[PDB]
Amino acid sequence: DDSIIDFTTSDYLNLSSAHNLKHAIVNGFDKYGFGSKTDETQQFEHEFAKFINYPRAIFFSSGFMANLAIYSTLFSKHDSIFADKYIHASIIDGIKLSQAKLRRYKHQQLSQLQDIYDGKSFITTEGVFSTSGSITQLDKLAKITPEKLIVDEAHSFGVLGKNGRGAINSFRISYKNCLICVFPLGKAFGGVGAVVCTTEAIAEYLIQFARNYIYTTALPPMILKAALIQLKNLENVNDNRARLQQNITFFNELCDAKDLELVSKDLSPIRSIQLNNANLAIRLKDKLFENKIIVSCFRYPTQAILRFSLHSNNTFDQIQQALEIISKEVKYEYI
Protein backbone atom coordinates (compact mmCIF):
# COMPACT_ATOMS: atom_id res chain seq x y z
CA ASP A 1 0.00 0.00 0.00
CA ASP A 2 2.54 2.70 1.18
CA SER A 3 5.60 0.44 1.04
CA ILE A 4 5.46 0.81 -2.73
CA ILE A 5 8.67 1.11 -4.58
CA ASP A 6 7.82 3.15 -7.67
CA PHE A 7 10.36 3.09 -10.48
CA THR A 8 7.90 4.46 -13.07
CA THR A 9 6.97 8.04 -12.10
CA SER A 10 8.87 10.88 -13.62
CA ASP A 11 9.04 12.93 -10.36
CA TYR A 12 12.84 12.76 -10.40
CA LEU A 13 13.39 15.40 -7.71
CA ASN A 14 10.34 14.48 -5.62
CA LEU A 15 9.05 17.99 -6.21
CA SER A 16 5.37 17.06 -6.89
CA SER A 17 4.93 16.99 -3.13
CA ALA A 18 6.70 20.30 -2.47
CA HIS A 19 5.37 21.58 0.87
CA ASN A 20 5.50 25.32 0.00
CA LEU A 21 2.92 25.55 -2.80
CA LYS A 22 -0.38 25.43 -0.92
CA HIS A 23 -0.76 29.19 -0.35
CA ALA A 24 0.14 29.80 -3.98
CA ILE A 25 -2.66 27.58 -5.20
CA VAL A 26 -5.17 28.96 -2.75
CA ASN A 27 -4.37 32.54 -3.74
CA GLY A 28 -4.33 31.79 -7.41
CA PHE A 29 -7.79 30.29 -7.02
CA ASP A 30 -9.16 33.25 -4.99
CA LYS A 31 -7.89 35.61 -7.72
CA TYR A 32 -8.78 33.69 -10.91
CA GLY A 33 -11.31 31.13 -9.81
CA PHE A 34 -11.51 27.75 -11.46
CA GLY A 35 -11.63 28.63 -15.18
CA SER A 36 -9.58 30.66 -17.71
CA LYS A 37 -9.13 34.12 -19.31
CA THR A 38 -1.99 37.21 -17.38
CA ASP A 39 0.43 39.00 -15.04
CA GLU A 40 1.73 35.66 -13.79
CA THR A 41 2.07 33.98 -17.20
CA GLN A 42 4.41 36.73 -18.43
CA GLN A 43 6.11 36.77 -15.05
CA PHE A 44 6.71 33.05 -15.37
CA GLU A 45 7.80 33.30 -18.98
CA HIS A 46 10.22 36.07 -17.97
CA GLU A 47 11.70 34.02 -15.12
CA PHE A 48 11.91 30.86 -17.23
CA ALA A 49 13.74 32.52 -20.10
CA LYS A 50 16.13 34.06 -17.50
CA PHE A 51 16.80 30.71 -15.85
CA ILE A 52 17.48 28.93 -19.14
CA ASN A 53 19.20 32.01 -20.59
CA TYR A 54 17.11 32.38 -23.75
CA PRO A 55 15.68 35.57 -25.28
CA ARG A 56 12.03 34.45 -25.06
CA ALA A 57 9.70 31.95 -23.44
CA ILE A 58 6.14 31.03 -24.38
CA PHE A 59 4.08 29.00 -21.95
CA PHE A 60 1.98 26.20 -23.42
CA SER A 61 -0.61 23.94 -21.85
CA SER A 62 1.30 20.74 -22.68
CA GLY A 63 4.41 19.31 -24.25
CA PHE A 64 2.32 18.01 -27.07
CA MET A 65 0.67 21.35 -27.70
CA ALA A 66 4.07 23.01 -27.86
CA ASN A 67 5.27 20.52 -30.43
CA LEU A 68 2.26 20.77 -32.59
CA ALA A 69 2.45 24.51 -32.51
CA ILE A 70 6.09 24.36 -33.54
CA TYR A 71 5.94 21.75 -36.31
CA SER A 72 2.59 22.69 -37.82
CA THR A 73 3.28 26.45 -38.07
CA LEU A 74 7.00 26.50 -39.00
CA PHE A 75 7.05 23.47 -41.32
CA SER A 76 5.12 21.95 -44.24
CA LYS A 77 5.30 18.83 -46.46
CA HIS A 78 8.20 20.52 -48.41
CA ASP A 79 10.55 20.31 -45.45
CA SER A 80 12.35 17.43 -43.97
CA ILE A 81 13.15 16.88 -40.34
CA PHE A 82 15.88 14.56 -39.12
CA ALA A 83 15.19 12.63 -35.97
CA ASP A 84 16.65 9.82 -33.87
CA LYS A 85 14.91 6.45 -34.44
CA TYR A 86 13.80 6.50 -30.76
CA ILE A 87 12.41 9.98 -30.58
CA HIS A 88 9.28 10.06 -28.42
CA ALA A 89 6.01 9.18 -30.10
CA SER A 90 4.43 12.47 -29.08
CA ILE A 91 7.09 14.40 -31.07
CA ILE A 92 6.54 12.12 -34.10
CA ASP A 93 2.80 12.77 -33.88
CA GLY A 94 3.41 16.54 -33.96
CA ILE A 95 5.71 16.18 -36.92
CA LYS A 96 3.45 13.90 -38.88
CA LEU A 97 0.54 16.32 -38.40
CA SER A 98 2.79 19.07 -39.73
CA GLN A 99 3.24 16.76 -42.79
CA ALA A 100 7.05 17.33 -42.86
CA LYS A 101 9.05 14.43 -44.20
CA LEU A 102 10.78 12.56 -41.39
CA ARG A 103 14.27 11.13 -41.88
CA ARG A 104 15.52 8.82 -39.19
CA TYR A 105 18.82 7.62 -37.87
CA LYS A 106 19.81 4.83 -35.54
CA HIS A 107 19.97 5.64 -31.88
CA GLN A 108 22.60 8.28 -31.09
CA GLN A 109 24.52 7.42 -34.27
CA LEU A 110 25.70 10.93 -34.99
CA SER A 111 27.99 9.57 -37.70
CA GLN A 112 25.08 8.03 -39.52
CA LEU A 113 23.25 11.35 -39.17
CA GLN A 114 26.24 12.99 -40.76
CA ASP A 115 25.99 10.47 -43.66
CA ILE A 116 22.36 11.25 -44.57
CA TYR A 117 22.17 14.92 -43.44
CA ASP A 118 21.31 17.40 -46.19
CA GLY A 119 23.21 20.36 -44.81
CA LYS A 120 20.00 22.36 -44.34
CA SER A 121 17.08 20.74 -42.48
CA PHE A 122 16.14 21.02 -38.86
CA ILE A 123 17.00 18.15 -36.50
CA THR A 124 14.90 17.24 -33.48
CA THR A 125 16.22 15.41 -30.48
CA GLU A 126 15.74 14.75 -26.79
CA GLY A 127 18.18 15.84 -24.13
CA VAL A 128 17.57 12.57 -22.30
CA PHE A 129 15.64 9.99 -24.29
CA SER A 130 12.48 8.74 -22.57
CA THR A 131 13.04 5.39 -24.13
CA SER A 132 16.61 4.51 -23.39
CA GLY A 133 17.74 7.15 -20.99
CA SER A 134 20.67 8.10 -23.26
CA ILE A 135 22.10 11.65 -23.11
CA THR A 136 22.48 13.21 -26.57
CA GLN A 137 25.90 14.92 -27.05
CA LEU A 138 24.47 18.25 -28.05
CA ASP A 139 27.92 19.70 -28.53
CA LYS A 140 28.81 17.14 -31.21
CA LEU A 141 25.36 17.48 -32.75
CA ALA A 142 25.77 21.26 -33.11
CA LYS A 143 28.97 20.76 -35.12
CA ILE A 144 27.04 18.51 -37.58
CA THR A 145 23.86 20.60 -37.85
CA PRO A 146 24.81 24.15 -36.84
CA GLU A 147 21.84 26.52 -36.33
CA LYS A 148 19.38 23.68 -36.79
CA LEU A 149 18.61 22.12 -33.44
CA ILE A 150 15.29 21.51 -31.75
CA VAL A 151 15.70 19.91 -28.31
CA ASP A 152 13.08 18.46 -25.98
CA GLU A 153 14.14 18.79 -22.31
CA ALA A 154 11.42 16.63 -20.82
CA HIS A 155 13.92 14.38 -19.08
CA SER A 156 17.01 16.65 -18.72
CA PHE A 157 15.39 19.65 -17.15
CA GLY A 158 15.88 19.76 -13.38
CA VAL A 159 18.30 16.91 -13.74
CA LEU A 160 21.21 17.91 -15.99
CA GLY A 161 23.13 21.19 -16.00
CA LYS A 162 23.73 23.82 -13.45
CA ASN A 163 21.08 23.88 -10.81
CA GLY A 164 19.04 21.60 -13.18
CA ARG A 165 18.82 24.08 -16.04
CA GLY A 166 19.11 21.15 -18.40
CA ALA A 167 20.92 19.60 -21.37
CA ILE A 168 21.32 22.71 -23.55
CA ASN A 169 22.84 24.41 -20.47
CA SER A 170 25.11 21.53 -19.57
CA PHE A 171 26.65 21.29 -23.06
CA ARG A 172 27.00 25.16 -23.22
CA ILE A 173 24.95 25.50 -26.38
CA SER A 174 23.61 28.93 -27.34
CA TYR A 175 20.38 29.84 -29.06
CA LYS A 176 22.59 30.48 -32.07
CA ASN A 177 22.98 26.67 -32.36
CA CYS A 178 19.59 25.61 -30.90
CA LEU A 179 16.88 28.05 -31.86
CA ILE A 180 14.13 26.17 -30.06
CA CYS A 181 14.13 24.07 -26.86
CA VAL A 182 10.94 22.81 -25.27
CA PHE A 183 10.56 22.33 -21.54
CA PRO A 184 7.70 20.09 -20.46
CA LEU A 185 7.02 20.71 -16.79
CA GLY A 186 5.33 17.38 -16.06
CA LYS A 187 8.46 15.53 -14.95
CA ALA A 188 11.15 16.74 -12.63
CA PHE A 189 9.39 20.08 -12.36
CA GLY A 190 6.44 18.21 -10.97
CA GLY A 191 3.88 20.52 -12.56
CA VAL A 192 1.98 20.81 -15.77
CA GLY A 193 2.36 22.54 -19.10
CA ALA A 194 5.36 23.21 -21.26
CA VAL A 195 7.63 26.24 -21.99
CA VAL A 196 9.06 26.90 -25.41
CA CYS A 197 12.38 28.85 -25.31
CA THR A 198 13.39 30.63 -28.56
CA THR A 199 14.55 33.78 -30.29
CA GLU A 200 12.47 36.95 -30.57
CA ALA A 201 11.78 36.22 -34.25
CA ILE A 202 10.48 32.76 -33.71
CA ALA A 203 8.52 33.74 -30.58
CA GLU A 204 6.70 36.59 -32.29
CA TYR A 205 6.08 34.42 -35.32
CA LEU A 206 4.64 31.72 -33.04
CA ILE A 207 2.51 34.16 -31.09
CA GLN A 208 0.97 35.52 -34.31
CA PHE A 209 0.37 32.26 -36.27
CA ALA A 210 -0.15 29.72 -33.43
CA ARG A 211 -2.61 31.88 -31.44
CA ASN A 212 -5.27 29.15 -31.38
CA TYR A 213 -2.78 26.59 -30.14
CA ILE A 214 -1.65 28.89 -27.29
CA TYR A 215 -4.86 30.53 -26.10
CA THR A 216 -7.66 28.04 -26.93
CA THR A 217 -5.79 25.46 -24.82
CA ALA A 218 -4.31 27.54 -21.96
CA LEU A 219 -4.10 26.16 -18.44
CA PRO A 220 -6.16 27.81 -15.73
CA PRO A 221 -4.41 31.00 -14.40
CA MET A 222 -4.91 29.87 -10.78
CA ILE A 223 -1.84 27.61 -11.01
CA LEU A 224 0.76 30.13 -12.29
CA LYS A 225 1.58 31.47 -8.82
CA ALA A 226 2.49 27.88 -7.84
CA ALA A 227 4.59 27.45 -10.96
CA LEU A 228 6.77 30.47 -10.09
CA ILE A 229 7.52 28.91 -6.72
CA GLN A 230 8.27 25.53 -8.28
CA LEU A 231 10.78 27.17 -10.65
CA LYS A 232 12.67 28.17 -7.52
CA ASN A 233 12.19 24.81 -5.86
CA LEU A 234 13.69 23.14 -8.90
CA GLU A 235 16.60 25.59 -8.87
CA ASN A 236 17.13 25.09 -5.13
CA VAL A 237 17.12 21.27 -4.61
CA ASN A 238 20.74 20.56 -5.51
CA ASP A 239 20.90 17.95 -2.78
CA ASN A 240 18.04 16.08 -4.51
CA ARG A 241 20.06 16.10 -7.76
CA ALA A 242 23.07 14.72 -5.92
CA ARG A 243 20.92 11.94 -4.34
CA LEU A 244 19.58 11.19 -7.78
CA GLN A 245 23.04 10.84 -9.19
CA GLN A 246 24.14 8.60 -6.44
CA ASN A 247 21.13 6.26 -7.30
CA ILE A 248 22.04 6.41 -11.00
CA THR A 249 25.64 5.56 -10.33
CA PHE A 250 24.75 2.71 -8.00
CA PHE A 251 22.24 1.33 -10.56
CA ASN A 252 24.83 1.24 -13.29
CA GLU A 253 27.54 -0.33 -11.09
CA LEU A 254 25.11 -3.05 -9.94
CA CYS A 255 24.05 -3.87 -13.53
CA ASP A 256 27.69 -4.04 -14.50
CA ALA A 257 28.43 -6.39 -11.58
CA LYS A 258 25.50 -8.66 -12.48
CA ASP A 259 26.13 -8.46 -16.25
CA LEU A 260 22.69 -6.92 -16.81
CA GLU A 261 22.73 -5.03 -20.12
CA LEU A 262 21.68 -1.38 -20.37
CA VAL A 263 20.41 0.23 -23.56
CA SER A 264 22.53 3.14 -22.34
CA LYS A 265 25.23 3.56 -19.68
CA ASP A 266 24.78 7.36 -19.58
CA LEU A 267 24.14 9.05 -16.19
CA SER A 268 20.40 9.79 -16.45
CA PRO A 269 17.48 8.73 -14.26
CA ILE A 270 15.99 6.49 -16.91
CA ARG A 271 17.69 3.11 -16.90
CA SER A 272 16.49 0.65 -19.51
CA ILE A 273 17.40 -2.98 -19.04
CA GLN A 274 17.68 -5.06 -22.17
CA LEU A 275 15.93 -8.49 -22.24
CA ASN A 276 16.06 -10.67 -25.35
CA ASN A 277 12.68 -12.14 -24.48
CA ALA A 278 9.31 -10.37 -24.11
CA ASN A 279 7.83 -13.21 -22.08
CA LEU A 280 10.56 -13.07 -19.48
CA ALA A 281 9.84 -9.36 -19.32
CA ILE A 282 6.13 -9.58 -18.48
CA ARG A 283 7.13 -12.14 -15.84
CA LEU A 284 9.74 -9.92 -14.24
CA LYS A 285 7.27 -7.11 -14.15
CA ASP A 286 4.62 -9.24 -12.44
CA LYS A 287 7.34 -10.63 -10.22
CA LEU A 288 8.68 -7.21 -9.22
CA PHE A 289 5.17 -5.98 -8.66
CA GLU A 290 4.36 -8.90 -6.20
CA ASN A 291 7.33 -7.50 -4.34
CA LYS A 292 5.76 -4.00 -4.23
CA ILE A 293 8.15 -2.82 -6.96
CA ILE A 294 6.67 -1.07 -10.01
CA VAL A 295 8.61 -0.65 -13.22
CA SER A 296 7.63 -0.14 -16.84
CA CYS A 297 7.84 -2.51 -19.77
CA PHE A 298 8.39 -1.96 -23.51
CA ARG A 299 9.11 -3.83 -26.77
CA TYR A 300 10.38 -2.15 -30.00
CA PRO A 301 13.11 -3.55 -32.30
CA THR A 302 11.95 -7.07 -33.39
CA GLN A 303 13.91 -7.46 -27.75
CA ALA A 304 12.05 -6.15 -24.64
CA ILE A 305 13.00 -3.51 -22.10
CA LEU A 306 12.35 -3.14 -18.40
CA ARG A 307 12.48 0.55 -17.75
CA PHE A 308 13.39 2.06 -14.45
CA SER A 309 12.66 5.69 -13.59
CA LEU A 310 14.90 6.66 -10.65
CA HIS A 311 14.20 9.44 -8.22
CA SER A 312 16.06 11.31 -5.54
CA ASN A 313 14.25 9.49 -2.70
CA ASN A 314 14.95 5.99 -3.97
CA THR A 315 17.51 3.97 -1.89
CA PHE A 316 20.22 1.50 -2.87
CA ASP A 317 18.34 -1.31 -0.99
CA GLN A 318 15.33 -0.82 -3.30
CA ILE A 319 17.52 -0.76 -6.44
CA GLN A 320 19.52 -3.76 -5.17
CA GLN A 321 16.37 -5.80 -4.44
CA ALA A 322 14.98 -5.11 -7.89
CA LEU A 323 18.12 -6.05 -9.81
CA GLU A 324 18.72 -9.08 -7.61
CA ILE A 325 15.29 -10.38 -8.63
CA ILE A 326 15.95 -9.58 -12.30
CA SER A 327 19.38 -11.15 -12.24
CA LYS A 328 18.11 -14.29 -10.69
CA GLU A 329 15.49 -14.88 -13.42
CA VAL A 330 17.83 -13.99 -16.38
CA LYS A 331 20.20 -16.76 -15.11
CA TYR A 332 17.55 -19.41 -15.96
CA GLU A 333 17.45 -18.11 -19.51
CA TYR A 334 21.16 -19.05 -19.78
CA ILE A 335 19.95 -22.56 -20.70
Q: Residues in the site for its own copies, rule: CB under 8 A?
A: 9-11, 16-18, 21-22, 25-26, 29, 33-37, 61-65, 72, 89-90, 93, 97, 186, 189-192, 212-213, 216-217, 219-220, 222-223, 226, 230
Q: Name the strands in the sheet holding 304-309, side by side, starting at the edge strand that comes first in the sequence.
A: 270-275, 304-309, 296-298
Closest to 274 in 3D by CA, of 256, 261, 258, 285: 261
DSSP 8-class letter at 220: P
Beta carbon of residue 33, minimum distance to its own copies (angstroms, whole number): 5
Beta carbon of residue 265, minimum distance to its own copies (angstroms, whole number): 28
Beta carbon of residue 115, minimum distance to its own copies (angstroms, whole number): 31
Beta carbon of residue 120, minimum distance to its own copies (angstroms, whole number): 26
Nearer to its own copies, 9 or 321 (CB): 9
Looking at the DSSP bridge assignments, the partners of residue 198 are 56, 180
Instruction: Indicate if the alpha-carbon torsion angle 143, 144, 149, 150 is positive or negative.
Output: negative
Nearer to its own copies, 217 or 318 (CB): 217
Nearer to its own copies, 107 or 187 (CB): 187
Please return the burial class of 25, using the count of CB atoms within 10 Å of its CB with bins 0-12, 13-18 and 19+: middle
Nearer to its own copies, 215 or 289 (CB): 215
d(C-alpha 196, C-alpha 5), whole Å? 33
Nearer to its own copies, 212 or 302 (CB): 212
Beta carbon of residue 159, minimum distance to its own copies (angstroms, whole number): 16
Nearer to its own copies, 102 or 192 (CB): 192
Beta carbon of residue 329, minimum distance to its own copies (angstroms, whole number): 28
Residues whose CB falls within 8 Å of the CB of residue 205, separated by 6 or more in sequence, listed in order: 73, 74
d(C-alpha 280, C-alpha 302), whole Å? 15
